[PDB]
Each structure stands twice: as structure tokens, then as C-alpha cells.
């Protein structure tokens, strides 16, 4: 369902205002995800894309969600006056719980998650990482 | 307007009522005592409220919420406690 | 530092506040300072949450609170309109204050451990020990429905239908009681996302349209 | 610009935001609203430095030194009758890191 | 010197035949290296480039040199019968010395290199973490 | 297909490649050319299994089991009259891994 419109009309974009290594992902013409080159904290890239193409942004290491233009998804519009579209990528409001969980997933190896001194559900919250595919069902 | 939050070590944190109400748990629980939250965690919980308030939908680029590792675990408890 | 508190302090204080629950002075000030300081210490008590023990005795207390209220209405079937409804209010205002207070247990213990109602109906489990591990307010209302509304429904309906039929006849029945009893049929399923009004429509609205037709047909 | 603070005095701490342009005395009114102690009965310090009532918080509490996520300390000492108590029970220390961290 | 020619004439290419995660690099119009999306072991991509653009390939973890069609560098050509040009990316036959250095470089944390029971020049050998700019200088 | 071998006998080892389709006897000719012992006076083993002269190396030396970088062992036992000596002094073991490895 979430598969890029094959318009073939170019649109240039300027892409990172977050303490993350952003991974840009494009959703292809058939709906399959394709990862593009990563952007370190504070970096800019001018890039070429196309009108009605579906982009989303994640953290490259941990797969976490990142916002673009204060929203969850980005689509190139028209390059009016030939000007490239801006894609200002930033952190979402993460919960205090998750801001803490990020930290736990990053220090402990997955094999030792069920050894932690917590109730079952907090293991099941650890083992449900930021799975991109499940967010595509949420966006659909 | 304010509310009082008292750590396990008796430190009393007085915060903007609104900042406190940020927590689903504090909303649940105006002088709350936290026999299980020592003043280093509580002060950072208060920093998080202050942070969330100041940086939630702010024009200035959002800096990462720094958390010290040692308190990350106690603050995780307080976060999972507070929600 | 994150620590354990025994259920006896937390729970019996809770129980007292869940009985006192008809009012929120104890929520706004006392639950902020005193009540929650006890139960929050325990709910996700650092080494192990006594949130399970608390939920269990809270449920048994709510069942006993609702059964005490139910007894008072079962023999007082005329009072089913006044009392099953007003008791629904004392106890449901309670479910709300319980849930202000309990938003910690509710979030930190109950929801983290909370198996979906579909998981429990199609054969799975670890929450419905004695009622599903629902928020205390949802648990309270589920218990109110199961123990007050469902057993008293035939009397509640019959009385409301007679009182309204008498209103159509020109009598002035207790309007506030009638409206409150009717609202209780709505709130007792407010937690069900698929159909929050089904119970009210099948149990009260269908019988009500039928008696109203027979009244205007005669008029 | 908002300045984020911890107004600390013995076992007291006040987490609140105030403007960089706001004064020590206005902060004492906020503290009054909090601890029910009037400003004359308060001595505020920027961290541990005694601040005069007419000074702005900017005069070192800046939005980036008194930050939301890393607030500056505003010492508070209350006045027991004629004089101010000695200026902060520090916050408790956290426990040691488990081997796995 | 070594830089892509701004021909603006398009070319389609098929890009791995190794047990490594390949990192393609494009040498821009100014000669500066711009990294592109990786290819894991045995994977393919059909990609769009331009005639007279300069490509090279490294490893994604170690920055090791890799070959494309037995050559160190690749340049796209005109698509005869519309068919995409094949870039078969492989390992070189390294020196046995370089092969030993790889294994040591990737296991041991650099601070401990000067701590090893080896002759002093081998530290100097190990401390070339296969520099791409030095290899641009080498190819110039 | 090339099959890479280690024709090993006691402390001796011969590194050579032969075709998957080549015979045990042809390998014994390679060994004869090297160790100056005639083929009948050689018992070749695929690893430790006794091989018959007419068998192809494929019949377990395959290019992917007898690989250049991980050759199969071809045991060799020399002839003691009518009989073969007992079949390979193994190669020495490596030292323990340094802690940094």
C-alpha cells in the first residue's frame, strides 16, 4: 500500500538536527524498503529524489524512529523556483520510560534480557525493538 | 503554582504543579513522598520535566536528554514508576 | 533509592482509601502526600513488585465492596434504581480516584503484565487470576457490571420502564435517579473500545422503545 | 529565554523555570508560593554565590548553563529570624554500576 | 586530479562476490570521496550512474581495498542494447603479510598494538588502517 | 576440478593438487616422483581411509573438501614388505591465544 508513486518527475532535497546517525530509507515502487547513505549529527547532504516518493528516517544502529520536518514521513513536493526541498530531521518526544529503555538495549546483549530482575512484560518490551515493518502496518 | 516531591533521603523538591502533573503516576498519586527515590534521581526526574516542558515543540534544536549511567538505572525505575 | 515496601501497608491503606473513595480530598492532597507514598513504594517495589499481591487483594476487596453494595440492593430491589445506581456512583467515583491513585500500578505493573482480553478468551493467560489485570478503575467497573448490573438488570429495567410509563401517564417519578441509573448502564462498559454502548442498547434501549410504542399507541 | 533551576537549601530543592531576565526577588516569590516563606526570609545564591534581590538570573543562570536537562543550582538559605542559615544538603550519591554496565 | 567528469550522460550498472560487506565510494566532481550504500555477502543492486564517473570499493568495517572486475577502480560505459554494465566486486589476492595484519587489526584495539611481541616496524604496518586518501595519492 | 592435498606419512607431508578425476595411483606416481618410493609400496588414505589405486580422488577428495586453503589429508603409509606400516605424526598444536586476542 505504502509504495512510491512512479511519477518520474525530479525533486532535489536538502537532508540532520539530532544526536543520531540517521539512516534514510526509501519505500520502493512495490513497497519494499531500501536503505540510503547515513547522515551523522549536524550534517547536511543535498540529494536527488522524485515527487510522490515515500521517505522515512531511522537511527542506523538501533533502528529507532526519527522525525523529519516535525513529522514521521517525508514526500518531495515541487522544486518551485528550482529550490531544493528542506528535510530537517530531529528527535521525537520519546517517553521517559523509553529514554531509559534505549539505554538498557544499548548496554545489555539480547541473550541476557530474560536474566534481568523485572516482570515478564519489560522483557517483552526489550525484545520488541523499533521494528520498522510493524510501523508500516501502523502507518497503513 | 507548585507541589512538593520528597525523596527517600528526605530532600524536598518543590516543582511547578504542571511540571509534576506530566507524570501519569504523579497524576495518580499535594506533597508526595518517595521513600524509594533518592534525591539524585528525583532531581533528574525534575530535570526531565523541566526539559520536556522547555524542549517539547521548541524552535531551538533539541539537545539529547543527558542521563548519567548510574542514575539511568534508578531513573529507569523512577521512569517506569512515574510513567 | 528504588526499594521494596510490603503490601500490608500499601494495600490496607489503599483499601481504606478505596472504601473512603466516594471522595477525592484524600486523592488530591492525601493520595499525593500519604496514600501514594505507600502504594507507589510497593507497586513496582525494586526487588519484586508486590503489585500482583496488591492487585489480588484489591480485586477481592472490590468484589467484597461491590458484594456488600449488591447485598444492600438485592434485597432492596425497589431501591435497585436508587442504590444499584448510587452505589455504582460511589464505587465508580471510587474507580476514578482509585485510578488517579492507581495510575502508577495501572501503568507500571498492571499494563506491563496486561494480557489482552482476546488472549484470555481464546485460551492464554497470566492476568485474570481473579478478574483480568485491568486498570483498577476498569477492574472496578468490570466488577460493578458483573456483580451489580448483570444480576439486578431485570429489576432495574422493569422499574425504569414502569416509572417512565407512569411519567407518560402524567406521574412525576424521581428523574435524577432514573437518569443516573440509565447513565450507569453506559459507564459500566465505557472501557470496551469495540462497543461502549452495547450493554445499554440491548439491556435498556430495546425494552424502552417497545414500552414507549405501546404507550403512544394507546394515547 | 527560560532558565532551569534547582533552588537548594539544606534538604529543600525547588525545580522551576524562570526567565533569564527575571530577578532573584521574583524567584523568591516563586519560592514563597512553594515553601510558604517570604522573600525577605530567603537568601538566594547562584549555585552557592549570594545573589542580591535586584539581580537578574542571567547575572550566570543562562538558558544554556541553567538548562532544562541540567539546571543550575540556586542556593537557598532561609532566615531563622535575623540571619540566614549556613547555605545545601547535597543530593545523595547513586550506587555503584553493576559489572554488566 | 582523479574526479568524476560532469558528462551528464547516464549509465545503468549492476553492482558482490566475497564474504565481506562491501562499501562503494564515488569520487565526486571535485575529487573528494562520497560513500554509497553497502552490499552484504553475495548481494546485488542495479544502480544508475553516468559515463566518466569514478567509482572504487572498500570494506564497510576495516576500510580494506576490494577489486571491481579485477581492477581497483571502475568507470561506467554506454549501455549497448540498453543492457546494464556488470561490476563484479571481489577480494584481491592480498600479500600474506597484509592478510595477517587484517586479522590482528580487526581483533586488537589499537592502543595495545605497541604492547605486542613483534618487531617495531610491524606497529607502523598495523597503524595504516587502510587509508583511502593515501590510496588516492598512490593512484595519482 | 583441482583437489588440494597433504600427502602425510609420519613426519612427512607432501602438498600437492591433483584432479578430482585423477586416481590414487596417479597420486602415488606424484609421490614416487617426490619420495622415490614406487606406488605399490605406498598405501594412500583419504585422510585416514585406505584408498585403492584405481579410485579417483573424488571417490572423498572434492575441490570443496580437499580445498587449496584447507587441503584434505591423504594419509601415506609406506610399505613394510607385503604390509603397510601403521598410518601420520599430527602437526604440532599452536600456543594459547594471547589475552588481547
Numbering used by the authors:
A (entry chain C), E (entry chain H): 62 to 76, 78 to 202
B (entry chain J): 17 to 45, 58 to 111
C (entry chain I): 4 to 222
D (entry chain F), F (entry chain D): 1 to 59, 61 to 88, 90 to 103
How did the manuscript describe this experimental structure?
CRL2^VHL^ assembles from VHL, adaptor proteins EloB and EloC, the scaffold protein Cul2 and the RING protein Rbx1. VHL is recruited to Cul2 via the adaptor proteins Elongin C (EloC, 12 kDa) and Elongin B (EloB, 15 kDa). The RING box protein 1 (Rbx1, 12 kDa) enables the recruitment of E2 conjugating enzymes.
The molecule, developed and disclosed in 2017 by Maniaci *et al.*, consists of two copies of VHL ligand VH032 connected by a PEG_5_ linker. The resulting sample was applied to copper Quantifoil R1.2/1.3 grids, which were plunge-frozen on a Vitrobot Mark IV and imaged on a Glacios 200 kV with Falcon 4i. Subsequent data collection of 7,216 movies and image analysis resulted in a 7 Å resolution structure (**Figure S2**). Given that CM11 indeed degrades VHL, we sought to rationalize how ubiquitin transfer could occur in this complex. Interestingly, at the 2D class level from the cryo-EM dataset, we observed some particle stacks which deviated from the 3D consensus volume, suggesting conformational heterogeneity in the sample and thus more opportunity for VHL ubiquitination than suggested by the structural model (**Figure S4**). Our model shows how CM11 folds on itself to mediate VHL dimerization, and how the PEG_5_ linker must cover a long distance to allow for the two VH032 units to achieve their ‘crossed’ relative conformation (**[Fig fig1]**).
